[PDB]
């Protein structure tokens, strides 16, 4: 699949509950990759489709 993308989806998982607890404001470095991680979420649909 793409274990790293598994990390990407896992990367969106973090901002979900954690952002609302601290990253609410700051985080202009992890928030960005998280967005791409979402796109990675779709690709993930393909990685899963793959292996």
mmCIF file of C-alpha atoms in Angstrom:
data_model
loop_
_atom_site.group_PDB
_atom_site.id
_atom_site.type_symbol
_atom_site.label_atom_id
_atom_site.label_comp_id
_atom_site.label_asym_id
_atom_site.label_seq_id
_atom_site.Cartn_x
_atom_site.Cartn_y
_atom_site.Cartn_z
ATOM 1 C CA UNK A 1 0.000 0.000 0.000
ATOM 2 C CA UNK A 2 2.146 2.833 1.327
ATOM 3 C CA UNK A 3 2.767 2.476 5.062
ATOM 4 C CA UNK A 4 3.904 6.053 4.934
ATOM 5 C CA UNK A 5 0.580 7.175 3.702
ATOM 6 C CA UNK A 6 -0.785 5.095 6.474
ATOM 7 C CA UNK A 7 1.222 7.650 8.360
ATOM 8 C CA UNK A 8 -0.437 10.367 6.333
ATOM 9 C CA UNK A 9 -3.899 9.283 7.337
ATOM 10 C CA UNK A 10 -2.403 8.943 10.746
ATOM 11 C CA UNK A 11 -1.213 12.496 10.187
ATOM 12 C CA UNK A 12 -4.776 13.722 9.791
ATOM 13 C CA UNK A 13 -5.808 11.698 12.816
ATOM 14 C CA UNK A 14 -3.454 13.745 15.004
ATOM 15 C CA UNK A 15 -4.880 17.260 14.076
ATOM 16 C CA UNK A 16 -8.407 16.036 14.640
ATOM 17 C CA UNK A 17 -8.391 15.940 18.494
ATOM 18 C CA UNK A 18 -4.953 17.488 19.108
ATOM 19 C CA UNK A 19 -5.451 20.664 17.058
ATOM 20 C CA UNK A 20 -8.514 21.644 18.988
ATOM 21 C CA UNK A 21 -6.396 21.314 22.139
ATOM 22 C CA UNK A 22 -3.344 23.375 21.174
ATOM 23 C CA UNK A 23 -2.688 23.667 17.450
ATOM 24 C CA UNK A 24 -5.820 25.792 17.328
ATOM 25 C CA UNK A 25 -3.617 28.756 16.488
ATOM 26 C CA UNK A 26 0.026 27.867 15.863
ATOM 27 C CA UNK A 27 1.168 24.928 13.764
ATOM 28 C CA UNK A 28 1.962 26.448 10.376
ATOM 29 C CA UNK A 29 4.311 23.562 9.640
ATOM 30 C CA UNK A 30 2.412 20.438 10.634
ATOM 31 C CA UNK A 31 -0.987 21.696 9.548
ATOM 32 C CA UNK A 32 0.149 22.038 5.950
ATOM 33 C CA UNK A 33 1.441 18.427 5.552
ATOM 34 C CA UNK A 34 -1.735 17.328 7.250
ATOM 35 C CA UNK A 35 -3.699 18.789 4.359
ATOM 36 C CA UNK A 36 -1.615 16.846 1.917
ATOM 37 C CA UNK A 37 -2.096 13.914 4.208
ATOM 38 C CA UNK A 38 -5.766 14.178 3.344
ATOM 39 C CA UNK A 39 -4.894 13.908 -0.303
ATOM 40 C CA UNK A 40 -2.787 11.020 0.908
ATOM 41 C CA UNK A 41 -5.964 9.685 2.419
ATOM 42 C CA UNK A 42 -7.438 9.346 -1.059
ATOM 43 C CA UNK A 43 -4.274 7.883 -2.437
ATOM 44 C CA UNK A 44 -4.608 5.620 0.550
ATOM 45 C CA UNK A 45 -7.853 4.459 -0.901
ATOM 46 C CA UNK A 46 -5.636 3.379 -3.768
ATOM 47 C CA UNK A 47 -2.846 1.933 -1.636
ATOM 48 C CA UNK A 48 -5.486 -0.202 -0.031
ATOM 49 C CA UNK A 49 -6.786 -0.959 -3.478
ATOM 50 C CA UNK A 50 -3.223 -1.981 -4.227
ATOM 51 C CA UNK A 51 -1.795 -3.929 -1.283
#
